[PDB]
Amino acid sequence: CPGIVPRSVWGARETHCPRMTLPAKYGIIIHTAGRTCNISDECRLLVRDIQSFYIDRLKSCDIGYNFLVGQDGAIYEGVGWNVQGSSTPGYDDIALGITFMGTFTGIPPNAAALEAAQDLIQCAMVKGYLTPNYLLVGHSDVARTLSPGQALYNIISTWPHFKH
Amino acid sequence: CPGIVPRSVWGARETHCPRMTLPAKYGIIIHTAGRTCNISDECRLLVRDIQSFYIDRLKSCDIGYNFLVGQDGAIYEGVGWNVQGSSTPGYDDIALGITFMGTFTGIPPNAAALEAAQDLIQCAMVKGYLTPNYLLVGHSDVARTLSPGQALYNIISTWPHFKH
Numbered sequence: 001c002p003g004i005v006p007r008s009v010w011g012a013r014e015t016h017c018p019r020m021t022l023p024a025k026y027g028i029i030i031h032t033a034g035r036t037c038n039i040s041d042e043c044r045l046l047v048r049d050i051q052s053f054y055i056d057r058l059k060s061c062d063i064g065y066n067f068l069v070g071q072d073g074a075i076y077e078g079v080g081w082n083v084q085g086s087s088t089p090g091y092d093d094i095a096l097g098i099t100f101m102g103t104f105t106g107i108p109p110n111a112a113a114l115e116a117a118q119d120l121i122q123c124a125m126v127k128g129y130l131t132p133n134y135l136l137v138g139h140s141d142v143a144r145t146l147s148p149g150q151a152l153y154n155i156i157s158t159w160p161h162f163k164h
Numbered sequence: 165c166p167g168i169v170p171r172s173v174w175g176a177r178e179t180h181c182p183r184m185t186l187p188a189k190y191g192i193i194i195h196t197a198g199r200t201c202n203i204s205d206e207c208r209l210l211v212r213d214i215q216s217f218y219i220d221r222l223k224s225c226d227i228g229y230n231f232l233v234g235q236d237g238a239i240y241e242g243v244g245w246n247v248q249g250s251s252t253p254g255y256d257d258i259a260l261g262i263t264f265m266g267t268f269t270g271i272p273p274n275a276a277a278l279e280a281a282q283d284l285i286q287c288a289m290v291k292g293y294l295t296p297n298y299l300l301v302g303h304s305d306v307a308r309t310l311s312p313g314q315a316l317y318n319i320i321s322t323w324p325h326f327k328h
């Protein structure tokens with residue numbers, strides 16, 4: 001199971017949103033469709049920016065993703081394990097939203113990032129956070145959106161438990 | 165744990181070989197460096213030749229791989245979780261050799277074959293056949309040889325615990 005830089009480290013704003021009880025029956029991969037980051041400091045600011053965006057512009061209760069993966073190869077805690085994401089209408093409370101920071105329509109995240117996400121996925125299943133036969137899906141498979149990019153979609157569609 | 169077709173199904177010849185100590189330290193990705201089989205009637209047969217090739221020609225105790233994955237999206241039991249392989253001189257006593265059947269230098273195995281390989285690793289992880297901090301490597305990293313081949317290599321480098 002990978003290391004996860006907590007909200008207390010990247011400077012997350014304190015909230016209190018809908019809690020989520022595990023295990024999750026879904027693992028949904030997302031991309032921010034925004035800029036990427038490839039170093040700690042940079043990535044921490046990017047998650048902070050994304051959160052503020054969710055609170056301020058969209059008026060969401062918090063960042064809409066359970067976890068984020070910077071191209072530094074680090075996993076950043078979004079709302080985390082126990083709190084509900086808000087990116088996939090209908091699925092949020094039964095899925096773990098894992099999103100890569102950046103725009104991967106024409107190019108996939110570097111290997112470091114990909115490794116960390118899967119390491120995170122495998123972990124979650126092993127520890128029962130994801131169900132034994134969890135379903136893996138891209139944002140675009142359940143929600144109408146370009147997320148997480150054809151390039152990235154090409155990769156996760158070869159991953160384990162990828163919903164057909 | 166994905167379905168694994170047992171030795172009895174593809175017709176392995178009986179043998180009693182040196183068992184391996186689990187969990188293993190490495191997960192080694194290999195390619196038969198031979199012909200690619202896309203349908204089961206072809207793949208099953210292929211696995212049989214490999215075994216005879218190993219027993220008959222190489223005078224080895226049994227087929228040299230722990231598992232074999234075909235493009236038919238089938239995982240086949242070589243010597244299994246409990247018996248030492250004989251594909252990596254120097255590591256056969258601490259690694260689990262998993263080989264895709266075929267050549268993959270310019271192009272990697274199809275999603276079906278790829279997915280299976282990882283679901284198998286995840287299985288080993290869940291069942292404890294691999295250590296919590298196991299290493300995933302390409303045969304070429306532990307043996308002077310193209311095996312497994314660039315395209316395939318470029319892919320496993322994005323898998324959990326890839327010991328790049």
Ligand code: NI
Pocket residue numbers: 001002119123296324325
């Ligand atoms: Ni791990």
Ligand code: NI
Pocket residue numbers: 161162164279
């Ligand atoms: Ni599948």
Ligand code: NI
Pocket residue numbers: 132133160161165166283286
């Ligand atoms: Ni599985």
Ligand code: NI
Pocket residue numbers: 194195251303311
């Ligand atoms: Ni080999």
Ligand code: NI
Pocket residue numbers: 254255
């Ligand atoms: Ni040794």
Ligand code: NI
Pocket residue numbers: 115325326327328
């Ligand atoms: Ni790594």
